[PDB]
Amino acid sequence: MFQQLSARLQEAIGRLRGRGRITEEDLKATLREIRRALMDADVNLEVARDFVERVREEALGKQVLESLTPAEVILATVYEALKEALGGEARLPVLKDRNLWFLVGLQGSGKTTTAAKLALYYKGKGRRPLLVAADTQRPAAREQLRLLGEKVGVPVLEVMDGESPESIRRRVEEKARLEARDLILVDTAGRLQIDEPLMGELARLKEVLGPDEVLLVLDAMTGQEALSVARAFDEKVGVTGLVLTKLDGDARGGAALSARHVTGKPIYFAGGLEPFYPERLAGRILGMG
Ligand SMILES: [Mg+2]
Numbered sequence: 001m002f003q004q005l006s007a008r009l010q011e012a013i014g015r016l017r018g019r020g021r022i023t024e025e026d027l028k029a030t031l032r033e034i035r036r037a038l039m040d041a042d043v044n045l046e047v048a049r050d051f052v053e054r055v056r057e058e059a060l061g062k063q064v065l066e067s068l069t070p071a072e073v074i075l076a077t078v079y080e081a082l083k084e085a086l087g088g089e090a091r092l093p094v095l096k097d098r099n100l101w102f103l104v105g106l107q108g109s110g111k112t113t114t115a116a117k118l119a120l121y122y123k124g125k126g127r128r129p130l131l132v133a134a135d136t137q138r139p140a141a142r143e144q145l146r147l148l149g150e151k152v153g154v155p156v157l158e159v160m161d162g163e164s165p166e167s168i169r170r171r172v173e174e175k176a177r178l179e180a181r182d183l184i185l186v187d188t189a190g191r192l193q194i195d196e197p198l199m200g201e202l203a204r205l206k207e208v209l210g211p212d213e214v215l216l217v218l219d220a221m222t223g224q225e226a227l228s229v230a231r232a233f234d235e236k237v238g239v240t241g242l243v244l245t246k247l248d249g250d251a252r253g254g255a256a257l258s259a260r261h262v263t264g265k266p267i268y269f270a271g272g273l274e275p276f277y278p279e280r281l282a283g284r285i286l287g288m289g
Helices: 003-014 024-040 045-061 070-086 111-124 139-152 165-179 196-209 224-236 254-263 278-285
Strands: 099-104 129-133 156-158 183-187 213-219 241-245 267-270
Touching (some): 003 024, 003 070, 024 045, 024 070, 099 196, 129 165, 139 156, 156 165, 196 224, 213 224, 241 254
Parallel strands (some): 099 183, 213 241, 241 267
């Protein structure tokens, strides 16, 4: 995962291998190399700085300068720091008896596909999901979700053009009652960029529907821009967790590695969609697969 970063971290660590004890300047050099590798992978500057300080403190705590196999001590330390940067421990949203979640994000994030994949994931766990195609301006966005629902075997309520949030609420409620739906996944409007009309409509929909989770879907390939998108969605709408898509196309990793620090939000899922496992990703970056 994250090809360029992975190669650079592995090389930085491997440079230390089979050479016996290393010097302080050797360690500092290695840290500077890791820092540059993170920077080049579009990790947020402060995240990268904190990461290497963490590694250094942890490595020195493990007596790296006395070690006869310092590369292994570095490897361990970097693994942990990666784990932590990525979220520490696997996290998922809390289901209750009934749940109504928003998916938010830019057109291009994979939001709509993600909504359908999440519905399938939770159907496999025994929930009874309902997809809601909530774009009140674009019939094609609603049709997209309708087709995906048919593919995954999950019902889809399509909002009407210009439908009020209150009417959406009523129709969703009705359908959920008639169909015993217990997980309502609202695919909100996707647009190419953030603007005030979008935000205001999302914020209003949120006031009226009262979602228990707001999942922000981000194309990881956008790098740091994703986290600026995240901050904007959080400030203007309010997010509870992230879904990162297109991780397999991301050679860099900066968004994943920076999200916890920058946004304070968990990465729930990774995009054909699985719960996000920070430890697995940390291993993959380091070549343990
Ligand atoms: Mg308000």
